[PDB]
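Limitations
The C-alpha cells in this dataset are predictions for the assembled complex, not deposited experimental models. Users should treat interface geometry with appropriate caution, especially where small molecules or nucleic acid strands are included. An illustrative entry is reproduced here so readers can see what is and is not provided.
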Amino acid sequence: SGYDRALSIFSPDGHIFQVEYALEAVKRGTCAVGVKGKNCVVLGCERRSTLKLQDTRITPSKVSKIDSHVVLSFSGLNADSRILIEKARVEAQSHRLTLEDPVTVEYLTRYVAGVQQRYTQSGGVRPFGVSTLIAGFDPRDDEPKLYQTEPSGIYSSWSAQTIGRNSKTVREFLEKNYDRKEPPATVEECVKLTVRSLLEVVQTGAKNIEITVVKPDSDIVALSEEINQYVTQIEQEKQEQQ
Amino acid sequence: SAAGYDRHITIFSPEGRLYQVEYAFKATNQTNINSLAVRGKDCTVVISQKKVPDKLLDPTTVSYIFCISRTIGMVVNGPIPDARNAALRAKAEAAEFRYKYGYDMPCDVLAKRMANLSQIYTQRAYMRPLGVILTFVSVDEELGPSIYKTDPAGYYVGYKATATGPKQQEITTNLENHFKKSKIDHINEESWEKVVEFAITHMIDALGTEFSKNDLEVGVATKDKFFTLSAENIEERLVAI
Amino acid sequence: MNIVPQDTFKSQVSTDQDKSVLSSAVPSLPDTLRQQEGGAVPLSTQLNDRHPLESTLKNWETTQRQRQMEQYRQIFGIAEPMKRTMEMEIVNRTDFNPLSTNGSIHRDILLNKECSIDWEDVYPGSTMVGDDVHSKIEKQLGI
Amino acid sequence: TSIGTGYDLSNSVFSPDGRNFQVEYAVKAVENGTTSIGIKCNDGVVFAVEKLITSKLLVPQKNVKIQVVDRHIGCVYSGLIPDGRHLVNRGREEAASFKKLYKTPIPIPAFADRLGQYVQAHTLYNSVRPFGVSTIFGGVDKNGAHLYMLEPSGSYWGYKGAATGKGRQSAKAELEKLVDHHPEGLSAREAVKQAAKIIYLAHEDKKDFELEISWCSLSETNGLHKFVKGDLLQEAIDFAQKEI
Amino acid sequence: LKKGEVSLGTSIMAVTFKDGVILGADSRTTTGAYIANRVTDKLTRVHDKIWCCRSGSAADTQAIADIVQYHLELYTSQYGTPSTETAASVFKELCYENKDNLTAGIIVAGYDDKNKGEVYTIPLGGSVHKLPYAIAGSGSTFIYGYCDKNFRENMSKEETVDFIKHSLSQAIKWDGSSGGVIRMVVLTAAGVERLIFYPDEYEQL
Amino acid sequence: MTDRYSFSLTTFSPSGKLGQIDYALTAVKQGVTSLGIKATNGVVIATEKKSSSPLAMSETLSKVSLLTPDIGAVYSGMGPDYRVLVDKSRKVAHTSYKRIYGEYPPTKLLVSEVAKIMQEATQSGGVRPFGVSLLIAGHDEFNGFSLYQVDPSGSYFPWKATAIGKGSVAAKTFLEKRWNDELELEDAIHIALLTLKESVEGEFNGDTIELAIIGDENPDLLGYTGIPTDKGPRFRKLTSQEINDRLEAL
Amino acid sequence: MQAIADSFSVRLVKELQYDNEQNLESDFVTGASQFQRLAPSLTVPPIASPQQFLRAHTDDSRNPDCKIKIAHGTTTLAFRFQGGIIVAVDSRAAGNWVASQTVKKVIEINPFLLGTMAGGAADCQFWETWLGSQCRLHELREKERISVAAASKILSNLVYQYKGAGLSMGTMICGYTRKEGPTIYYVDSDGTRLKGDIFCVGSGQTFAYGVLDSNYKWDLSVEDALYLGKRSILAAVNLYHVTEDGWIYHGN
Amino acid sequence: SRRYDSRTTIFSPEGRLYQVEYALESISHAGTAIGIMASDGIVLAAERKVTSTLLEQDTSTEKLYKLNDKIAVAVAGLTADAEILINTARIHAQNYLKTYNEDIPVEILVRRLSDIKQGYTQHGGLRPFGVSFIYAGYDDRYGYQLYTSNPSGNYTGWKAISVGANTSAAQTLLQMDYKDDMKVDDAIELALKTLSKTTDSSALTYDRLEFATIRKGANDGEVYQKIFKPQEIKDILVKTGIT
Amino acid sequence: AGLSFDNYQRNNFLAENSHTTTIVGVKFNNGVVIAADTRSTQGPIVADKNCAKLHRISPKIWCAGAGTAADTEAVTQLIGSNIELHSLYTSREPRVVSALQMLKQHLFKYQGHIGAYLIVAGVDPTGSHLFSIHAHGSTDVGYYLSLGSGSLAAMAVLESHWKQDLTKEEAIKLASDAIQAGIWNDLGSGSNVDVCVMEIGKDAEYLRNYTP
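Predicted assembly:
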C-alpha cells in the first residue's frame, strides 16, 4: 500500500497498518479465555499437542503468576511474553517497595500497556506481538478484575474475553451463554463455563486445556486430571441432552 | 555500474568490490595534473605540472604542494578542497606526534596514519573517502631521502621514485628505463639543484612539451627543512638547462 | 585552555536528577530496586568525603581533548573542530553492541590511541534487575 | 552528461565518472543568480553589483546588497540569499576571533582558507547540502590587496578579476579585455569606471536596474572598505552610459 | 606548592639591548640543602628564537612549556614564525586559567623582525608585564638595587653580557640556591648564540 | 528519533545466507594466494608480495607481521583491513594477557579475540564486514605449535596445512598430496616453496616472496644477554638472500 | 552539524555565568520553567565539603531575624480509637510577631490528612506542601483516595534521599481511611518511619504520655478522648478530630 | 515477499517476521546434533562438517562446549555467534556462583540466553543470532535436564531431540527407538545409529563425530562430564560395529 | 574503569578507628651503565639478600626505581608495554626520549599520587641517554645520577672519580665502587651488586651479582 512500512505513518483513511499486522500476528497463536465470576476469576489456555519426545515435567505454564494476587496469560509470541512478564514482575516488586502497597490490577495493566506503547514510539524497535489478559483482585476487597491489553498499548476491562486463533467461536459462545446480570455465583460454575467455551475450538480437551482459578485474599489455585473430569462431565451432560 | 544499496555507501558488491573507492580513484585523476617525485643522495624533489588556462586567475595562489612540518612536504593529486583538508589533517597529526612522543614525525609513520584514516572512511557507511592521492616526501634521519604515497583505498607504500597523474605510465616507464640503465636506484647528483634539473628534463622528455617558469611547481626536502621553490628559482634552473 | 579538570562539582541536586531510574509509581523519586546500589545509598553521600583525585582522573582525557579543540579553533578555524566532533559523533552513534563494553577500533584510531595503553584499558570494570539487552536498547533509543 | 541519474540524490556520493552531482547542481543554482564582479587595482579592490529595481516600498537606505565583513574586508555573492548571508556571518565571526586573538586584522589569505574549509566541510556528509552561492570577496592587508572567489565545492582562488551570475561570461571577456588594456597596472578610479562599464554591458536582459559599487584601497580609503559616494557613482554611471 | 614537590630556586635575568635580547640563568637544582644537580639547562627553547625560564613547580612549568611549544608548532604550520607577544599570551592564558591548581612563573625572551627582541614576565598568579629587563628567583632579591643602578637602554652586546655576568655573580654569591656555571642565550637578527661562564671566571670580577 | 540508530548492514537472504559475508569471502578469494603448513618442529607461512609499477620498495610493505614474539599472521584480501586488525590484535594481546598474567597469550586465545572482533564487525549497522582471511601460526608451552584460519565471518579452524586466495584449491590438493605426519621444518619450507612456485605468474625470486617461520628460540634476536631463563623470539622472517639460496638449492 | 559549528564559535556571557541552562532557568531568563519542576531543585555550594560549610554558616547567630525558624514543639500528642484520631497541640507562644490569626502548628496537607510540625518549620511546611501535591496527583491518577501508608512512605523516601544534608524535621502523619482505618505514622529527617497508636513529642512528652497511658482505652467516646487529650496536654490547647469524612478543628 | 524482509522490525500483512524465519532456515545448512536424556545420564552426539583431511581433528572443539562443570552445549549454526553466546553464558554462570555460592540451574541459564537472543531480534540495528543450542545439564532441582533454543528466542524441554540438517529423519528414528528406562550405553548406541542412518557420507568415521556424556556418580555421588577423545569414539564405533 | 576508588571511605573509617637501596647511573663515552644493590628489607628485617632491582623497559632501555615498589613496578611495566607497541607500530628502535615523555605525562596525570622515582638509562640510534624522573612529573638530565637512601655516598664516590672521557671498564668500575660505598656505609643497602651496560650498536649486557 505504501503506508504500511513504518509505525509513524498515517494512512489516508486514518489507520496504522503496523498495529493491525501486530494484531494479526497475535491472532496466530493459541487461544486464551478469561472469565469473571461473582467472586472468582478463571483463566483458560490452549496447549498445542504435546509431542511424544517432549519433556512434560518442566513444560511452561501459559498462565504466569505476576504476584500473589495477580495472574497473567498471553496470546501471540512466547518470548515477547516472557520479556513482558519479567518487566511486570519487576515493576510490581518495585511498586511494593516504594509505596508499601501491592499493585492493583488496573495499575499493573496500565504499566504493561505503557511498556507496549513505549515500544511503538521508535522506528528502531519492533512492538511486542502479544495480547495479554490480566486477572486478579485488588488487595483490599473482593471485586474481581479482568483486563485485556493489546500490542498498541490499549487496555480495556472485560467480563469474559477470548484472544487468539479461532477466538470468534469462543466469543460467540460466551455471548450466548454468559450474562452479566447473573454471573456464575460459585467457582465450579465458572470453571465449567470456561471449559465448555474452550471445548468449542479444542480438538481434545483431555490434554489441551489449562485452567487457573483466582479467588480473593490472594489465594490463586491452579487446577491439575480435574480438567479431564470436567470435560467428561460436560460430555455426559451433552449426550444426556441428545 | 553499481546496483542496489551499494551506490551511496561502502559495502561489498556481489563481486566483492567497493565501488565508492574505485569512483574516488576515478575522481583523483580529474584535475589533469601530473606530478613527479625523485630522491637524490641527500635530498628529495617533487615537481608538479602547473596549468593556468585562465588569465584572470592569480598564478601565485595556485599550489598543490604543502609544507606539513619542518621536514615533511606533501603533494596532492586531485581536487584542491580535499587537498587542503588533508593538508590541515596532516599538519595537526604531525604536531600531535611531536608533542606526544618527543621527536619529529617520520614520513612513513605519517603516511600510515593517513592510510588508517582512509581505511576508516572506506569501512564506515556514513563516511566517504577523500578523492585525493597523497605523496609525502622528506629526508628521514634514519632512512635518508624518503618518498611515500597513499591512496583513497587506504593503501600506502614507499617508492624509489614515483609519478602520478593521467599520463603517469609514460613517466613511470621512462623512470624504470633510467633505473635499469644506472642500477643505483637513486640519483647520483650531490646537489639538489642538479636533481631538480634532472627531474625537469625527465618531465619534459616524458610529456613531450616545454614548460615556462609559471608551468612548474617545485618543492625540495633536505635534512633540515623542506622549502618550495619560487618562480625565479625555477627560471634559473630552466636557464641552466 | 585547561590542564587539570575544573568545575567538577555540582551546583544543585534533586531527587529526580537521574531520569533513567525514575520510579513509575512516583516519577519524582528514584527507584531504589532498579538502581541495584545496595538500597542504602542516598544521593547526599555522593557530595561529601570524596577522593580529591577521582574527579581529576574521570575528566582528564575529556579536558585534554577540549583543550586540543580550543587550540584548533584558535589556529585553524571552526571547520577543524566541527569536523573532528562530527566524525567522533558518527562513530559513536553507529556502534551498538549490548554484549560488550570495549570501544571500537575506529574510535581508538580517531583518538590517536592505536598503540597506547592506560589503566582504563587494562581494568575495564548476579543482579536481578536491569542488566539485559532490553534495558540497553531503551537507554540507547530513549524509550 | 549534465544529469547523472542514480548518483545525484545524496550529497556525498561519487558517480562512476568520479563526480559529485549535488555540487554541480549547486553551481547551476549559482548560475541563475545576479551578476556580481570584482576588480583588483594597483593598491585596492573594487566590488560591483547589478541589482534589480524592486518595489518603491522598500527603504532605499537600509537595503544594501554588498556585505561588509570587517573594516578591511568586502564581500559579494551570487546564488541563494540565506546561504550567502550565513556565509557572511561565519566570515564575520572568524575575523572577529582572529582579531581578538592576535591583535591584528586577519590577513586575507587566512580568511579565504578558513571560509574554504568551512564550505568544503559541507560536502562530506549526506545530512547537509552544499552552499548554493559563489562568493567574491577581497580586502587590503600588510601584503597588499587580495581578491578571491569561492565556489560551492569549497574551492577558492585568487583572481585579477572575477565575475559571477547570469552575465558572467561576457563580463569575464570584458575583464580579460581589461587585462589586455592595462597590463602594467590600474588605478582605483579607473577600476570604478571600468566596473560600471562592465556591469552596464553585461546587464542587457530587460526591467530597470541599479548599480552598487564599493571599493577598498590604501591610497584612497586608508585601507578601509567604503561605498562609492554620490559624485563618483554618478560619474561612473555617466561614463558607462557614454561608453555605450 | 605540594608536599615533596621540587621547587625552582633559580636566578633568572633577561635583558634587552640594542641588537636583541639576552636571557641568562644559573644551573643549580636543590632539595632544600642538598644539591641534586650541579649542572642544569634552565634555558627552555619554546621556538627557534623564543626562549623562557621557569620558576615555581618544576612539573607544572614543564607541562606548560610543552603545551606552549606544541601550540607554537601548530601556529607555525599555518602562519609562519610567531611573535614574542603571542607566546607570552599563550603562557599567560595557561598560567592564569590554571592558577588554582598549578604554581608556575615564566620569563619569556624573544626576537622578531617587527619588535626587535622583547622581554615578558609572568609572576605567580598569571599576569603578564612587558619590561626592558626582568629578574626572578630566590637570588634576584639580592641584586634589585644593583640592577636598578647599572641598567641602560640600547647597550652594546659586550656591555649587556658584562652586566648580566656581574649581576648573576652577585646573586650566586649571596644566595644558597644558586649554582656554579652561568648560561646565557643571545637572540639577535644574526641567530642564536650560547655562552657559558665558569665560577673561576666570574668569582674574580 | 531516526538518528540514534542505524539499520543492520548485514541481513539474511531468504535462503538463510548472509550476503555481506559471502561477498567478503568472494573478495578474499580474489586476493593473492597465502599458504601455511605446520611441521613437527615449526610452522611455515608464505605469501606472494604483489607489487605496483616496479618503482616501489617491496621491503617497506610487509604482508607478514609479528603479533607476539611467538605468534605471527598472514592475510589474503584487503591490506588496510589487515593492518588495522594487526594493530588491534597486538593491543589486545598486551591489554588482556600481558598486563594481567604477565605472559603473552596462547595462539588459540589470540585467534579467538580476532574472531570476536570480526564477528562484532559483521553484527554492526554502521560498518561492513571485514574483507580478509587470516592464517595465524603460533607456539605455546602447553600446546606446541598451532596453525589457524580465520574467515570474515569470525569462524576459525585449525589446519595441518592450508592456503587461501586465488590458487587455493590447487594448493590445497598439492599440500594434501605432500603433507605427512613425519614432516620437518626444512621439508615444510621446501613444500611451501614448491606450492608457491605453481601460483606466481611473474618472477619467482626472493623479492616477490614473503616467508616466516615459527621455529625455535632465537637468542641473537632478543636484543640483550644476561638472563638464561629469558628466551629469544620464536618467530623469524626469512631474508631475500636466504630465500634465494633455498630457491637455487633443493 | 550546524549546532556543532555554533558550539565552536566565539566572554561577557561566560563571566555572567549565563552560558549554563540552570542559571538561565533559575533567573527566569528564557521562561518560567523554574516554577514547572514537580521535584524541586536545591542549590549546594560547589566545594569539596558542602555539609561542613552549611553547618558552620548556619550555626552562626548574628541576626535574630536572619536565623532559620524552628517549630514550637512544646507538647503534641496523637492517639486513635474507634471514632477516629484525636490530635492535641499547645497554643503557646511576645516576639514582635503580631498577626491577625494565631500561628498554625498543624499542617493541613489535605482535607483528610494532618501533619504535625516539629524541628525546622520551613522544612515541614515546604515538604508537606510537596507531599500534598504528590498525593493529589496520585488521587487524580488512580481515581481513589491515597492511603496514609503510601503518603508516609513517600515522605520517608523524600527525607531519606537528603539524609545528612541539613534537614531537621519530624512529622506525624495522621489519617483515617475506609481501607485501613485510623493510622498514625512518624517520619523524621534521619529516615525512620514508625507506625504507632499513641505518640507524644515535645518537651513535656513524658508527663503527657504517662497521663495517656494511665487512662487509655480503644473503646471510648469522642468527648472522653478529647478530654483525655486536653488533660494530657495540660499536665505538662488546639484539638483536631480526624474521621473518615475529614479533619475538624476543636481548638479551645 | 521482498516487501517486508529488509528490516528486522517489520510485521508482514500476515503477521510474520521474515528475518527470524530466514535465520531459522539457516540452521538446515549445519551439521546434525542429537541430545538424548537417559535415566542416569545425558548423551550429546554431533556430526562435523569436515571436507578435507588437512583439518586438525585432535582439537575437537567445533560443536560441543562446556559452560561450567555441570552444563554443556551442542552448537548448530554459525560458530562465532555461538562463541559470543557461550562466553556470555560462562560469565553469567560465574556471576551466579559468586553471588549465591551455588551452581546456576540449567533453566535459568537457558532462559537468560533465550532472552538475549530474543532481544537481538527486536532491535533494527541487530540481526538475529543464527545459532541453535542443545543444553544438557544436571541440577538438584530437576535432576537431568535437556533443552533446545533457536534464533527466535524460544526454548523447549525434551527427552530426546535433534537439531541440524536432518531433523525430521533423526526425530523419526528417535521416536521409533526411545524407551524411558534406557541407560547411558543404550543412549550412546541410539545416538550412533541415528547419526549413521541419517548421514550424507556413508563412512561414519571417527574423525567426523563429537561425543559427550554427563553422568552421575563419579567419586561417590558427584556428576561429571566426559568429552570423548577420537580414540574413544573409534573404540565405541568398533564396539557397535559401525566403525 | 581504571584504578578504583571503592572502599576509600571505608578505609578512612577503619583508619580513624585504629585498624591498620642504592642506585647509580654513569654515562661514558660510548654508552651508559646502571648499577644497583641487591637487598630487600621490610623495615629492620632483611626479606631477601639477592633481589633484582634493575628492570627493563626495552631491550636497550633499562631503569631502576625507588619509593613505592608496587607503583614503580606497575608504571615500568605499563611504559614497557606502550614502548613495545609504539616500536611495533613504527617499525623502529624505541627512543629513550619517547619513554621519558610517556613516563612524565603519566606521572603528571596523577598529580604525584603515584610514588615512583626512577633512573632511566638507554641507548638508541640517536645516542646514549640518562634521565632522572620524579614522582610529580619532573625530569632531569645528567651525566651521573644517584638514587635511594645510599645516594649520598654514591654521589660522593662519583664526584671523586668522574671524567668526561671514560672507557667501558672505567665506568663499570666506578659504578661498582659507588654501589659498594653505598652498601658499606648505609644500613638499607647490602649484599651484591647488579650491573647493566649498554653501548652503541651492541646488545645490552646484564650482569647479576657482578661483585659478591
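Some entries come with short summary sentences. For this one: The first helix of chain I runs from residue 8 to 16.
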